């Protein structure tokens, strides 16, 4: 029992006959909010129940309403990598630069959580490579930290900077060289990563680098 309200219930746990037989009868219910502030598409969205997401998208729903925490149906999809769910909001127009409290975007949450097809369906859907969180951190800080070279080409493909600062100055290469990402390191520099950009303890990425990383991307870049 997630919600105070049937048809969500309905929709978490994937009863799409109910579901549908409730909403039918009552069309009011496919809108009707809950103690989250969520409807059945967020619900629907949560559990990944895509013939639940298609059904209350055709009927007509909104696709863009917040939760109490501020998560679209986008944000949600995109998290919970329903990668068929995400396409399905896409063609309904779901706003792919949409912020929830913390300041993130759906493709914030692909970046973090490794959604490689999901992320590349967003940047289609028009999603802003370079959007800063509440942290100034971008989907690229967070493939560079987490060392992810696939979702680093694609952000690349798709014209992602690689030199946005953090509030803590730091850009997504002095991450990848303090959490020793080597080859996403000698990646990031290859295609213009700053070894000049200092964070706000006064360090390059070069600086940052442990072993001999510093060195060896000083010479890609200085010779």
Known sequence: CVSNLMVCN???????????????????????????????LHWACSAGHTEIVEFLLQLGV??????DAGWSPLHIAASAGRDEIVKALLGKGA???????????????????????????????????????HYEATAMHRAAAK????????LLYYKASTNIQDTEGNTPLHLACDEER?????????????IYIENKEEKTPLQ?????????LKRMVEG
């Not at 080597?182 to 700053?194: I, N, R, T, Y």
């Not at 940052?208 to 060896?216: D, F, M, N, P, Y």
């Open 62 to 67: 909104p696709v863009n309403d917040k939760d």
């Open 147 to 154: 060392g992810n070279l696939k979702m680093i080409h694609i």
């Open 95 to 133: 706003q792919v630069n949409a912020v929830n409290q913390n300041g993130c975007t759906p493709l914030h949450y692909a970046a973090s959580k490794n959604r490689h097809e999901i992320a590349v369906m967003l940047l289609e859907g028009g999603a802003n490579p370079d959007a800063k969180d």
């Open 10 to 40: 309905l929709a978490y746990s994937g009863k799409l006959e109910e579901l549908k037989e409730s909403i039918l009868a009552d069309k009011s219910l496919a809108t009707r909010t809950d103690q989250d502030s969520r409807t059945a």
């Open 182 to 194: 080597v080859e996403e390191a000698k990646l990031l520099v290859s295609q213009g990563a700053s």
């Open 208 to 216: 940052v680098a442990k072993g001999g990383l510093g060195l060896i």
